[PDB]
Amino acid sequence: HDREMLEGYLKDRLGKVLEIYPASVKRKEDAIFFMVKNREDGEKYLVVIGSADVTEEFSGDYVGEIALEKSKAKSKVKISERNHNNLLVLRQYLPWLNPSVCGKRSSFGTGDRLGIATPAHVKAFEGKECFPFLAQQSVREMSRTGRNWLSVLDDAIWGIFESGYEGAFGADADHVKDLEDIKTAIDAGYTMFTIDPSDHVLDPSTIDKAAAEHVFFELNERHDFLSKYEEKVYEIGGRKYTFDRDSLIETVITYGKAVDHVEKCYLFLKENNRNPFELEVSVDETSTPTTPLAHIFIVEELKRRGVVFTNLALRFVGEWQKAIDYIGDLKELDSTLAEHAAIAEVLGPYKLSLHSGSDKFSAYPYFAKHVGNLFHVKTAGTSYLEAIRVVARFSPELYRRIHEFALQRFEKDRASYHVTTDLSKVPDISKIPDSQLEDLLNEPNTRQVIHITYGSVLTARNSDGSYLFRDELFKTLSEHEREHYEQVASHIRKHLDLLGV
């Protein structure tokens, strides 16, 4: 608890300058745990002080023996690498280092594509009335970063250990489509499962009438949607919603197989997951905004089938492009948000979930107004953009190289995402001095370019086979950690304030 003494002791016996994170220092059982950082290389290590019983479970090097006057028998001191086995043991000793279910209270997800931002995210959440999802990454993101459920969760939890936070947090398996991916997420101990059934969502206008009749027929013959919903009326939010036959048949053709897949996924979870879990159902990747009728159909179907969910991710009117503010008519956003909120109130209650909500500040007043008591917002890329901004500020040479590389790789990485980026409006880098490079991360189109080339930047390799930017990127962010943290935390805190929490 006296920091001099411990730093002195470690430097004397190990011959390295190891700096303790004061907030990380925990005392449980009769053991001490904390984290240190090597001033010279920026490597972090777990340090355990306690009996031989305790230190044996951890792997590592015995530094020496220390004299706590907690008693009089000398404690052992061990220095351990941050790996899976050591962190499993730690997670037993410090029980708060484990994801837990959020339930029906407002939450916010700070996904980390880099694996080093979680202390900053924890800073942002200080004193807020919000449940934090600190581990959140999608199947596609992990594909593009060479990561997995375990490595993502490990990165977040090491971050949490560094932070000293003891409150609750969640791990969100984002945009999972396959049972295989649900299975590995379960094995990793994730607490929320975001089901994406978009493979099974059908745009009726893309098939001919015979095909539509066939799809409707088979769904209907196994569920009888006609008997349950035809001509049914819902008086919600001072409005009347009627399932006329045509609206019903369209809605069934659009979402029927998707509801089946959501259910099958939920059953697999019930079968294979002993531990507590939540579910989010996502339908945000559709060609059109979700109609009120579709919202009602989906929710009533899930209740009939017994699929218990906490979050519903709708497609709202407008354009929700990555790295840029809301595009669209704010009055239509207001009115549809009123509708959807009213539906969620009478139908559930359930939390409406917003994907790609990062940086849509112009939309947040309406979001907070309609659902502020129960809501969820997902972010990830915005934190990566903040780290690139910090690179711009403290390593201009590196930002320049990344910038040009990002431009060359944008047409390739763009495909998967829908953006209307105007490449003509990306400023000329050659005309901007080093002292002002940072301001590029305030221009929309530049932001989109850097947002979307994250994979290429992070994984690109030389002819040699060495990483093109990865090593330097991580070294820079290590060297400017405090500024990195404060940058990212302030940006997330802005989001949280604007949401009324």
| Neighbouring C-beta atoms of residue 282, cutoff 10 Å | 23
321 contacts 449 by C-beta, under 8 angstroms: no
- Spell 428-463 as b/e; 16+ CB within 10 A means b: eeeebeeeebbebbeebbbbbbbbbbbbbbbeeeee
Has 174 been annotated as catalytic? Answer: yes
What residues have CB less than 8 Å from 423, skipping those under 6 apart?
Answer: 407, 410, 445, 449
**E strands, 180-321, in order:** 192-195, 233-236, 239-242, 278-282, 311-313
Provide the experimental method for this PDB entry.
Answer: X-ray
Q: Which two tokens stand for residue 407?
A: 């431009």
Distance separating the N- and C-terminal Cα atoms of the chain: 34
Which residue, 277, 95, 103, 85, is CA-closest to 186? Answer: 277
10 contacts 18 by C-beta, under 8 angstroms: yes
CA distance 437 to 433: 7
Which residue, 435, 437, 408, is CA-closest to 423? Answer: 408
Which residue, 383, 321, 311, is CA-closest to 353? Answer: 311
| Crossing angle of helices 149-163 and 179-188, rounded to 10° | 30
Helix (H, G, I), strand (E, B) or coil at 47: strand
Which entry of 112, 174, 263, 359 is annotated as an active-site residue? 174
DSSP for 240-274 reads: EEE--HHHHHHHHHHHHHHHHHHHHHHHHHHHH--
